[PDB]
């Protein structure tokens, strides 16, 4: 499957595309204002994502940091981002069916559609000034807003037990992108997609 991975923004962002425990494709790559990457997904992935990450700082060999999204200091990302990171989910050829999903359960740094290419379904976006927005305690200085797990580290936050349920801090996220998930147990927002299908994931989004 392809995914177009687009930058509309004023600023750089260095796009990332990982399963976990290995890269998608290259896994990542610098995407100035204006530039796109198209990616090949295989068929079956599941558990996969696509972020940005900002302000990075890498060197000759690809090794450094990024002020949101880093990826083991990495360039080509093989596992996933540091908080806060708006992320693009999927998993593909699930019982004949993709399944599509925008989350902020890992915080939220760059706004971003998820669309397939078909007319088949329809795409998900979470593209409100949430940065802008962010309570002070969920401020990332870094750039972007924190998840309220990552922040405070306790069950109420992070659905480690029991069953959790909204919180203010969820239901900040919720609120402004009700189609994108704002913790683990959040009535579902994910698309059904036909089979084998391709996508665009575009950051600043305008359309």
């Known amino acids: ?57 890498f060197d ?3 090794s450094g940091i990024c002020k949101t999204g880093d990826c083991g200091g990495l360039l080509r990302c093989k596992r996933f981002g540091r908080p806060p990171t708006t992320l693009a989910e999927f998993s593909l050829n699930q019982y004949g069916k993709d399944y599509i999903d925008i989350s902020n359960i890992k915080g939220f740094n760059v706004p971003m559609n998820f669309s397939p290419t078909t007319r088949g ?27 309220a ?23 900040f996220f919720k609120r402004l992108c009700p189609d994108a998930f704002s913790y683990v147990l959040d009535k579902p927002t994910t698309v059904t997609c036909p089979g084998s299908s391709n996508y665009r994931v575009t950051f600043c989004p305008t359309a």
């Open 60 to 62: 000759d060999s690809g």
């Open 149 to 171: 797990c990552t922040v405070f580290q306790t069950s109420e936050y992070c659905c480690t037990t029991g069953k959790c349920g909204p919180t203010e801090y969820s239901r």
């Open 121 to 147: 379904c329809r795409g998900v976006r979470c593209a409100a000034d949430i940065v802008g927005q962010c309570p002070a305690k969920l401020k990332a200085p870094g750039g972007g807003c924190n998840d």
């Open 1 to 57: 499957a392809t995914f177009e991975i687009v930058n509309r923004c004023s600023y750089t962002v260095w796009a990332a595309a990982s399963k976990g425990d290995a890269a998608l494709d290259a896994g990542g790559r610098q995407l100035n204002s204006g530039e796109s990457w198209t990616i090949n997904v295989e068929p079956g992935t599941n558990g996969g994502k696509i972020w940005a990450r900002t302000d990075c700082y």
